[PDB]
Amino acid sequence: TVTSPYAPSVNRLMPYRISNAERQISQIIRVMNIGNNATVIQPVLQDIS
Amino acid sequence: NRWLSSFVSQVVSDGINETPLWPQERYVQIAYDSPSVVDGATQYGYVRRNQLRLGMRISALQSLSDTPAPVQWLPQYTIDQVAVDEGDAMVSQLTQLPLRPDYGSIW
Amino acid sequence: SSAGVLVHYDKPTNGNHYILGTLTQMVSAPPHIINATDALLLESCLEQFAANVR
Amino acid sequence: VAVQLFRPLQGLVFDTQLYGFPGTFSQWEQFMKEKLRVLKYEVLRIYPISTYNHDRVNVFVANALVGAFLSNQAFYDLLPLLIVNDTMISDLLGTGAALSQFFQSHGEVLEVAAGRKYLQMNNYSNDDDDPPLFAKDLSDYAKAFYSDTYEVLDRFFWTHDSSAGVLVHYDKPTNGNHYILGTLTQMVSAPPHIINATDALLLESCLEQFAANVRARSAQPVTRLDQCYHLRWGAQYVGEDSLTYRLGVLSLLATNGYQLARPIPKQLT
Amino acid sequence: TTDPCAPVKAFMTLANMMVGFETIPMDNQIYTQSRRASAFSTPHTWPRCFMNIQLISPIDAPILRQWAEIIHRYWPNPSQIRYGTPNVFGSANLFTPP
Amino acid sequence: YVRLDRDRVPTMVGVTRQSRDTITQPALSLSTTNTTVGVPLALDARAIT
Amino acid sequence: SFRVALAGWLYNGVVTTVIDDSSYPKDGGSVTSLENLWDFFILALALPLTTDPCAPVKAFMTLANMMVGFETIPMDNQIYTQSRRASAFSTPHTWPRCFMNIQLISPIDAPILRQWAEIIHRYWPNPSQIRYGTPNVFGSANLFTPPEVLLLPIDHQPANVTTPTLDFTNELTNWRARVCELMKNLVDNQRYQPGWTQSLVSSMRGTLGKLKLIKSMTPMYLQQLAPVELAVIAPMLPFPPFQVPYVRLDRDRVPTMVGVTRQSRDTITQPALSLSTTNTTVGVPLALDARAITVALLSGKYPPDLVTNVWYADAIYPMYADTEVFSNLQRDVITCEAVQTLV
Amino acid sequence: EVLLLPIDHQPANVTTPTLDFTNELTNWRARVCELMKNLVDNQRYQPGW
Amino acid sequence: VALLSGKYPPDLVTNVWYADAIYPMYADTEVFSNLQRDVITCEAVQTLV
Amino acid sequence: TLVAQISETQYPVDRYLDWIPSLRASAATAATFAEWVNTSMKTAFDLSDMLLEPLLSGDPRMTQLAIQYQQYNGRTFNVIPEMPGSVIADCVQLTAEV
Amino acid sequence: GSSVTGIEIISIENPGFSNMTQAARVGISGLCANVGNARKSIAIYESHGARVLTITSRRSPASARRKARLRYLPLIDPRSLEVQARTILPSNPVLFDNINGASPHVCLTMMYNFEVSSAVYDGDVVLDLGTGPEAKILELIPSTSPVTCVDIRPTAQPNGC
Amino acid sequence: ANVWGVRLADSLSSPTIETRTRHYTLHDFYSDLDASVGKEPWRPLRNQRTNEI
Ligand SMILES: Nc1nc2c(ncn2[C@@H]2O[C@H](COP(=O)(O)OP(=O)(O)OP(=O)(O)O)[C@@H](O)[C@H]2O)c(=O)[nH]1
Ligand SMILES: Nc1nc2c(ncn2[C@@H]2O[C@H](COP(=O)(O)OP(=O)(O)OP(=O)(O)O)[C@@H](O)[C@H]2O)c(=O)[nH]1
Ligand SMILES: C[S@@+](CC[C@H](N)C(=O)[O-])C[C@H]1O[C@@H](n2cnc3c(N)ncnc32)[C@H](O)[C@@H]1O
């Protein structure tokens, strides 16, 4: 459970929200890299393990 | 066993004692008009409470017979009257109409 | 006398006496379990109801 | 060799070994008759008939209750939900009892697990003359998503995987509006073919509607005007020359009122 | 032992010992049939299927049914001995007769 | 000593030593102005057997 | 902590006193934990003394979080869960609809939880007000309250020392008795503590009975003599009391912001909001110690020869002998004239 | 916003978990054990037993 | 072996366990910068094209 | 019998020393006075272990004495013992009357 | 209960020996007025730990025409049902229960009844000679005409209403 | 009617005559002890469905 303030702000700026098209294109390029290697894949699985 | 279970389930249920008789400990009291004569044959333990009555008559249970099929009935009418819509609402409360009956044969 | 003591008052078996039931239980009536001081009383009660009708 | 199940006992979602039924049909029915009396006594003990005689009972709870009692799965949590109030679905959506073997809410979309239209015996051994069971004899062959509006259901299936095909009914469904989603189990008692139960449900309903078309008489009412399903969403995953597509076409034809040139028997094989 | 909940244990002991061979319907999903036997120390936690010998199916859990019958019918009975003399002394007992 | 009467199994034993607010009668104070007593003790089933 | 909480009643509109974050159970807690049960008891007795607009909701959701897995309540959206930390309810928009309306908590599903909610709604303390100062001579610096009124977050009655310690008419004594009885009901059947192999029901019962019938005079003090001391101290303070209304459970009247304006009423200018509006609460928060407040509520005592007239005369003399009201008045004159001259 | 799985998921009802047999993996194990149980047959599968 | 042997701790409540465990991994905002990286990747691709 | 002279109790004792002044007693005054009575009745009779401590950790102005237990079904049994006289309190009241 | 011709049955709980309340009496009277002197059969039995009796009978457009006359529904006397201390097992309801078909005497009587009903118009004063204890003519002619009838044996219909 | 389960109202009966007691003598003891075909000291109870002792 995270918490957030409730009062008049000072107009911050934190650009993070992006579109599903950008997410998908980045995923496609990243798969284009990672596929066929397995030496950058198996460490990922061991980390998740 | 099944009959005894049903009887005990009836006795331990919700409701109230609708009779004038409440149990004591000094003595088992007998109503003023009970047909039992046991106090006339016992020397100790019985008392006829004169000031409690039971308005019901005295006669053994008369049970009719059972039959495996329904029997015809013929209604008979009296003087009192009520509203037709009231009767229709009551029959709608008591009904069981939504059922599929065996059709039969016209001809 | 906490399980209830029962008298008979009419014509007991071998003279005047009280009865005191133990805490055993009847099992052959599945939905209910009676501790035999209700069992003796229920038996005699049903027997008297039978005798009234006949 | 088998048994078909009706209104009271139609919620047998669990595995077959948990119930421990006898083998022969006579022993089976005697067993179940002697157990349903105990269930009846419990239900009557909690609900007196005189005070609760003429009020709607929740069908989900009733089926789940017999199913839990037959498998010894702590049916008491189901008892205070047996009498409906204000809806047969919103009651289960608003309840907070911990019972997820039988159903689980998803924010205005109740999810119940359909179970065991049929039931198999010992002497049923995949014979060419045994009746087909259409995969509805084992535990989990599909899931039912009940709601109040098809708009809400359609919006539910945006973030839900509908690739085995989702089936609607549109005519007079069992307990209100709902979609059906079949799992990936398979029917084996038809040796040359193996169907993944989303073709099985559709084939069963389709043949039933073809049967009903031939026996119409214009003066004999039926319990339902069409039995077909009309697959709704997952068609993008099944194109030409697939059994699901062909069965969809046949079900559309049967709904419009066609008839098979070959006579279909009264008890399929 | 003087524990009032002694009888419900030695029933749930065997119920625990045989899980996967016979089953009985419990009250809820917390005090299930696999819960320990020592945890049933209160009158509030005695199983409905123990207070009713009927929910133990005679051909589903025959040995549990027999053990329930044995507990209900052959568990030892209390009694009393009548010590003391209240003539010189008094009687310090409160919830029994002197 | 109740054998198997679940209805008669005892649940508490408490002593009172003062009335509550205004109720002068102990028969009315005792229900809500008591302190419960009792301690459990463990035994060895194998030694007993 | 006890004295600072007692003194923060006079400054509701500037500083808001909340219970410390450390006082809540660890990781939400659980009813199967004796330590978390005593955590809940220590916490539920300190909350009614804080000038936090939403103390009741935190008191409810502490047990609502501890009760996860054994009882449930209806939720509002598909985002939050019953197991969200009770200390995160710091604003009126977080109050559960099932808390604002009792009948959404089914008693067949949340017995203990609905009992706790019902207790919160019925026996939570009632605000009140007491007169102080002399508005006919010293004026009155009250802004949002009438000219001679001192709002209090609890009820107060006339003062007498000859009153029963175990008086369940007193709101604080009644609250303690109700909390002890509810925890008793919680631990009775062992429906929520599967895992206690032994039988600690009798021990829990006895210790809760002791906590209930403890011989404390702090509730009597807070009811009778605390308001008198506050009203005697108030007109002599350098910074006089600045209060905002105490609403008990009426959500729609809970204050949420306090700003200052410097522009006229028939003009439109830059929306230069004041600097005090940028607070999540109504004022500068400060955390108190639930443990200290609870132990101070449990262990109070008077001198065995207290005579009220003598004591308060002897205390009032040396503090009115060192008063500065007559200088603060002239200071107020100069401040008003300075403001008008600047304009 | 979807994650596929090669087995059936079903949420839990209690936070104090206790063992039960009703799940597809235990059913799979039971099916396997029963097959080998009615496979063990010294006549026609293991002569020397 | 992992399937045949498995045991929870003797006295655990899953709400408390996961509330303790999951918390450290949700205080690291390494996931919010990957979105900016995806922004820049798509920008570079379109600029090249 | 002594506490009812300086405070308000629920026991019907006569009062002779009302013409003597006294403060409006409180819990602290009652507890103190009871402690002095206890110490005096120990010093006389030559005792050294806990004559009256069980009753002093409450409010001595309303001291009663009883016990009870409660069955599972809510039924309750209590034992409110009779309060036999005390020649010491009788002599104290006589001395006050004199 | 929507079709003008069909079956209709009700179930009321009568525990042992008792005088049936006003509600059950009104319900049975309403069913009688709805049926209109067709055959009526009863059954008494214990169903789900309760003792209840059911009354089965069919309705008809002649029944509706009779019901259109009476202003206040009469009330039967419950003695003949209260006296029943027996058990009468039920049977499945059937629309056309008569399996042997009507008899020629019944058919001739129905020819006569149809002739009467066709002869009588609306709003006409009539008088039948020897109707019987059951005024069957009340179900034949329209419900808006005085029907003063005579018979040597005393009637069995209501009076007033 | 009725207390909790309905009892026959409208009438009420009970026995009227009671047989006089008979003392138990050694001849009676011996005759009961040598159980003859007509009068044994026991009596079989049998099930109401299978009709067996
Ligand atoms: N061992 C002892 N058994 C007694 C003596 N005679 C009767 N029994 C018991 O005496 C008890 C009291 O008998 P009664 O007061 O007459 O009541 P009851 O209805 O006649 O009892 P039953 O004859 O068993 O139906 C019963 O529970 C009998 O089992 C016997 O001679 N010696
Ligand atoms: N457990 C759950 N089973 C449902 C409920 N009622 C029906 N079943 C299932 O509901 C599903 C949908 O039923 P329908 O849409 O009416 O189609 P159907 O042809 O009537 O299905 P069948 O009655 O099995 O032939 C079926 O697959 C049933 O097995 C029950 O009350 N609870
Ligand atoms: C069995 S009924 C049939 C009546 C038939 N439902 C009708 O009205 O068309 C014959 C009736 O004719 C009547 N009728 C025969 N002789 C009687 C006369 N002496 N007095 C008046 N009733 C006459 C009888 O009262 C008898 O009820």
Give yes or no for a contact between D28 and D143, defined as CB atoms under 8 angstroms apart: no
Q: Of I25, I45, H1, I29, whose CA–CA distance to A30 is shortest?
A: I45
Phi, psi of J34, rounded to the nearest 5 degrees? -65, -40
Q: Is D216 exposed, middle or buried (0-12, 13-18, 19+ CB in 10 A)?
A: exposed
Q: Give the residue among G295, G214, G301 at the shortest CA–CA distance from G43.
A: G295
**Which chain E residues are within 8 Å of J77, Cβ to Cβ?**
95
Residue of F nearest to J63 (CA): F18
Residue D166 three-state SS:
strand
β-strands B28-31, J76-79 pairing: unpaired
Please, which residues bridge with residue J46 across strands? none
Length of chain G as a residue count: 343
SS3 string, chain K, reads CCCCCEEEEEEEECCCCCCCCHHHHHHHHHHHHHHCCCCEEEEEEECCCCEEEEEEEEECHHHHHHHCCCCEEEEECCHHHHCCCCCECCCCCECCCCCCCCCHHHHHHHHHHHHHHHHCCCCCCCCCECCCCCCHHHHCCCCCCCCCCECCCCCCCCCCC
Take atom 22 of ligand 2 and give the residue whose Cα is closest.
D117
Dump the DSSP string for D235-268: GGG--TT-HHHHHHHHHHHHHHT---SSPPPSS-
Interface contact H33, partner D, CB < 8 A: no
- Please calculate the CA angle D226-D229-D232 and round it to the nearest 5 degrees: 135
Q: Are D186 and D194 in contact (CB under 8 A)?
A: yes
Which residues make beta-bridge pairs with K72? Answer: B83
The best mutation among K148, K152, K155, K157 to test binding of ligand 3, ranked by most ligand atoms within 8 Å of the C-beta, falls on K152
| Chain F environment of E45 (Cβ under 8 Å) | none
Q: Whose CA is nearest to atom 17 of ligand 3?
A: K152
Residue E28, both tokens? 């809820």
Nearest to J68 by CA among G210, F10, F15: F15
Q: Which residue has the tokens 């009596």?
A: L43
Q: Residue C13 and residue C17: Cα distance in Å, rounded?
A: 9
Edge to edge, what strands does the sheet with K51-59 contain?
Answer: B71-73, K40-46, K51-59, K6-13
The residue of chain G with its CA nearest to that of F42 is G198
- To 10 degrees, the CA torsion angle through F8, F9, F11, F15? 70
For chain L, the chains sharing at least 3 beta-carbon pairs closer than 8 angstroms are B, C, K
CB atoms H2 and D160 under 8 Å: yes
Q: Which residues pair with D111 in a beta bridge?
A: D104, D145
- The residues pairing with B95 across neighbouring beta strands, listed in sequence order, are K10
Ligand in closest contact with the CA of K127: 3
CA of K129 relative to ligand 3 center, distance in Å = 7
Ligand 2 closest atom vs CA D169: 15
Q: Which ligand is closest in space to the CA of residue D142?
A: 2
Interface E:D, ≥3 CB–CB pairs < 8 Å: yes
Distances (CA, A) of I2 to A44, D217, I6, I9, I24: 22, 63, 7, 16, 27
Cα–Cα distance, F37 to D238 (Å, whole number): 73
G341 near A CB under 8 A = no
Tell me if there are at least 3 CB pairs under 8 Å linking chains G and A.
Answer: yes
Residue B50 makes CB contacts below 8 A (sequence gap 6+) with: B32
Q: How far apart are CA D28 and CA D19, in angstroms?
A: 11
Q: What is the DSSP string of J17-74?
A: TTSS------HHHHHHHHHHHHHHHHHTTT--S-SSHHHHTS-GGG---EEEEEETTS
Chain C residue nearest residue E48, CA to CA: C31
Q: Select from D72, D79, D99, D100 the residue whose CB has the most chain E CBs within 10 Å, as the one to mutate to test that interface.
A: D72
Q: Which residue is closest in CA terms to ligand 3's atom 6? A: K131
DSSP B67: B
Q: Encoding tokens for residue K53?
A: 């009796």
**Chain G partners (3+ C-beta pairs within 8 A):** A, D, E, F, H, I, J
K15/K12 Cα distance (integer angstroms): 10
Q: Which of D174, D175, D207 to mutate to test the pocket of ligand 2 (most atoms within 8 A of CB)?
A: D174
> Mind telling me how many Å the CA of J68 is from chain E's nearest CA?
9
Under 8 Å CB pairs connecting chains H and I tally to 10
CB D77 within 8 A of CB E48: no
Find out whether G245 and G144 touch, Cβ atoms under 8 Å: yes
Q: Is the dihedral of CA G160, G162, G167, G173 positive or negative?
A: positive
Q: Which two tokens stand for residue C19?
A: 């009865």
Question: d(Cα B74, Cα G182) in Å, to the nearest integer?
Answer: 64
| Cβ of D144 below 6 Å from ligand 2 | yes
Ligand nearest to the CA of D198: 2
**Residue G278 main-chain phi, psi, to 5 deg:** -90, 50
Residue nearest to atom 12 of ligand 3 (CA): K130
User: Using CA atoms, how far apart are residues D183 and D136, in angstroms rounded to an integer?
Assistant: 11
Q: How far is CA E94 from the centre of its chain?
A: 26
Spell out which residues line ligand 3, taking CB within 6 angstroms. Answer: K 128, 130-132, 136, 151-153
Q: β-strands G15-19, G284-288: how paired?
A: parallel
Using CB atoms within 10 A of its CB, is residue A40 exposed (0-12), middle (13-18) or buried (19+)?
exposed
- In this complex, is the C-beta atom of E77 within 8 Å of any C-beta atom belonging to chain C? yes
Contact D8, D43 (CB under 8 A): no
Looking at ligand 1, which residue's alpha carbon is closest to its atom 10? C13
Interface-testing mutation among H16, H27, H31, with chain D (most D C-beta atoms within 10 A): H27
Count CA atoms closer than 13 A to K146's CA, side-chain side. Answer: 3
Contact K15 L9 (CB under 8 A): no
For residue K43, which residues of chain B lie inside 8 Å, CB to CB?
A: 70
Cβ–Cβ contact K50 with D under 8 A: yes
Indicate which residue's Cα is closest to atom 29 of ligand 1.
Answer: C13
Distance CA C44, CA K51 (A): 26
Contact yes or no for G74 and D98 at CB 8 A: no
What Cα–Cα distance (Å) separates residue G239 from each residue in G129, G142, G325? 20, 12, 11
Rounded to the nearest angstrom, the distance between the alpha carbon of K145 and the centre of ligand 3 is: 22
Nearest to C10 among B1, B4, B42 (CB): B42
Mutate to test the pocket of ligand 1, among C5, C13, C17 (most ligand atoms within 8 A of CB): C13
DSSP string, G292-322: HHHHHHH-----TT--HHHHHHHHHHHHHTT
**Cβ D59 under 6 angstroms from ligand 2:** yes
Chain G residues with CB inside 8 Å of J58's CB? 213, 215
Round the CA-based radius of gyration of chain K to a whole number and report it: 18
Q: Whose CA is nearest to atom 28 of ligand 2?
A: D114
Query: Distance between CA K129 and CA K120 in Å, rounded?
Result: 15
Give the separation between CA D174 and CA D224, rounded to whole angstroms.
11
Is there a contact between K146 and K120 (Cβ–Cβ < 8 Å)?
A: no
Long-range (24+ apart) CB contacts under 8 A made by E62-66 are E62/E22, E63/E14, E63/E18, E63/E22, E64/E11, E64/E14, E64/E15, E64/E18, E64/E22, E64/E24
User: How far away, in angstroms, is C2 Cα from ligand 1 center?
Assistant: 21
In degrees and rounded to multiples of 5, residue G69 shows phi and psi of 90, -20
Residues of C in contact with F3 (CB under 8 A): 23-25, 35
- H40 burial via Cβ count (<10 Å: 0-12, 13-18, 19+): exposed
Q: Say what the alpha-carbon torsion angle J26, J30, J33, J37 is, to the nearest 10 degrees.
A: 170
Residue D208: its H or E element: helix D198-214
Residue K117 φ/ψ, nearest 5 degrees: -65, -35
Distance CA D260, CA G252 (A): 69
Sort out which chain F residues have CB atoms less than 8 A from C37's CB and list them. none
Asked if residues K70 and K36 have their Cβ atoms less than 8 Å apart, the reply is no
D194 touches chain E (CB under 8 A): no
Q: Is residue D118 within a helix (H) or strand (E), and if so which, with residue range?
A: strand D118-120
Ligand number with the minimum distance to the CA of D144 = 2
d(CA D66, ligand 2 centre) in Å: 15
**Cα gap F5→E77, rounded to integer Å:** 12
Task: Report yes or no: L10 and B57 within 8 Å, Cβ to Cβ.
Answer: yes
Contact G195 H16 (CB under 8 A): yes
Residue I22 touches partner G, C-beta closer than 8 Å = no
Atom from ligand 3 closest to the CA of residue K134: 6
CB contact under 8 Å between K11 and B94, yes or no, is yes
CA dihedral E19, E20, E24, E26 (to 10 degrees): 60
CA of C44 relative to ligand 1 center, distance in Å:
12
CA distance H25 to H5: 14
Q: How far apart are CA G162 and CA J26, in angstroms?
A: 5
Which atom number of ligand 2 is nearest to the Cα of residue D59?
Answer: 31
CB K67 within 8 A of CB B85: no
Between strands B71-73 and K40-46, the pairing is antiparallel
Any CB–CB contact under 8 A between E54 and chain D?
Answer: yes
